[PDB]
């Protein structure tokens, strides 16, 4: 076994600041292939309360571009204007039939309030249970979709709901500038606490850990 340098360098007792062990994140790795960096975030959420839902999208700059699989629903000339955004399937309910076929390539599903009609009842159990619904608080169903799709496919890391208290989002590739990743990770507070559910509990951001795939264990302070 070669998975034990991690257990040599697990510091659960000495919690680090942002600057301390940030540079060691890949020095803690022995991976065969290349991976991304993950995040650790929490916030008091009544398991019971549903009025605690926050869906949308978080734009995280300075990093990976079009590495996402999107499915779009538009009506009109935007069916061709959207192909200018490098989108994959800008089309009609044939895409819904593709979903019925059990399609796992496309991950983030987009619509337009005119053709949203098609989207809602289509893949209805499927997309939303797939944790990919289309609310309006998030702008996944716009009228000016040209100005948003280039971003949603370009650089967006979406916040998600989980049955557990857990809410752990994703950072970009390991090989980026570690200091800049610190700023990127910092650019998440302004939105993760932009819209609470007003029934927040004892604290706001209890956990802060930066694990890349299974390698890094960097516990951090809620403030710093």
């Amino acid at each position: 076994k070669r998975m034990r340098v991690i257990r040599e360098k697990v510091d659960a007792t000495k919690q680090y600041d942002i600057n301390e062990a940030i540079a060691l994140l890949k020095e803690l790795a022995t991976a065969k292939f290349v991976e991304s960096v993950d995040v650790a975030v929490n916030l008091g959420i009544d398991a019971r309360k549903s009025d605690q839902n926050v869906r949308g999208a978080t734009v995280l700059p300075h990093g990976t571009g079009r590495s996402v699989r999107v499915a779009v629903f538009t009506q009109g000339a935007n069916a061709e204007a959207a192909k200018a955004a490098g989108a994959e399937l800008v089309g009609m309910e044939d895409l819904a039939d593709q979903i019925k076929k059990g399609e796992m390539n496309f991950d983030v599903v987009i619509a337009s309030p005119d053709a949203m009609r098609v989207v809602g009842q289509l893949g209805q159990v499927l997309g939303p249970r797939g944790l990919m619904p289309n609310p309006k608080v998030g702008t996944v169903t716009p009228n000016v979709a040209e100005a948003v799709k280039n971003a949603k496919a370009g650089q967006v890391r979406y916040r998600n709901d989980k049955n557990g208290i857990i809410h752990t989002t994703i950072g970009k590739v390991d090989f980026d500038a570690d200091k800049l990743k610190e700023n990127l990770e910092a650019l998440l507070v302004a939105l993760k606490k932009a819209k609470p559910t007003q029934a927040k509990g004892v604290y706001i951001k209890k956990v802060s850990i930066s694990t890349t795939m299974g390698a890094g264990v960097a516990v951090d302070q809620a403030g710093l």
């Binding site: 009025d51 309030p113 809602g120 009842q121 939303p128 609310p135 309006k136 049955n163």
Partner: protein, 188 residues
């Protein structure tokens, strides 16, 4: 939350008296000779669904509440929650067990069912009057010696039990009225 006075509100308003939404169903205003005016309102508790009787004083009054109803469409159930959506705003929404009480067995998928939401949150869902459902279990009816109609107990794909005439077998879709819990027709 404009406060409402007794001799002002007629039926339909959603008053918020005592940390609890209500719904005025009927109201009788009285102005007798020589005495303080009052209204005998036939209120409706909007959470348990029981009709309460309240005589209100001209002066006595209450704030309004955000209790509203429109046409949501059922999507799916997961664990303890039911999720529905609008066709004019396409706003997502999630209810709970309390809201769907005894209508669990009536909602299938894509049913357009009126729901009452309060504080921007559902409290009570009303299944469409007639729902088409399929029967999971029945005893193959055999007329035997029956001289009257007889009837037959039949479970449905959503758990419900209805009396179906005799011929409906298994795999036949029937139509039931959610209101009475009774068979209406076997939809071909």
């Amino acid at each position: 939350m404009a406060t409402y006075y007794s001799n002002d509100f007629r039926a339909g308003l959603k008053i918020m008296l005592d940390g609890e939404p209500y719904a005025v169903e009927a109201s009788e205003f009285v102005k007798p000779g020589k005495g303080q005016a009052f209204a005998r309102v036939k209120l409706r508790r909007l959470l348990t669904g029981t009709r309460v009787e309240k005589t209100f004083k001209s002066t006595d009054s209450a704030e309004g509440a955000d209790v509203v109803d429109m046409n949501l469409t059922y999507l799916y159930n997961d664990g303890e929650f039911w999720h529905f959506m609008n066709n004019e705003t396409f706003e997502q929404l999630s209810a709970d067990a309390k809201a769907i009480g005894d209508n669990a067995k009536w909602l299938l998928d894509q049913a357009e069912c009126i729901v009452t939401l309060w504080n921007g949150q559902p409290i009570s869902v009303t299944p469409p009057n007639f729902v088409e459902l399929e029967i999971v279990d029945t005893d193959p009816g055999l007329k035997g010696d029956t001289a009257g109609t007889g009837g037959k107990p039949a479970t449905l794909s959503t758990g419900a039990v209805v009396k179906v005439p005799l011929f409906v077998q298994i795999g036949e879709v029937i139509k039931v009225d959610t209101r009475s819990g009774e068979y209406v027709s076997r939809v071909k």
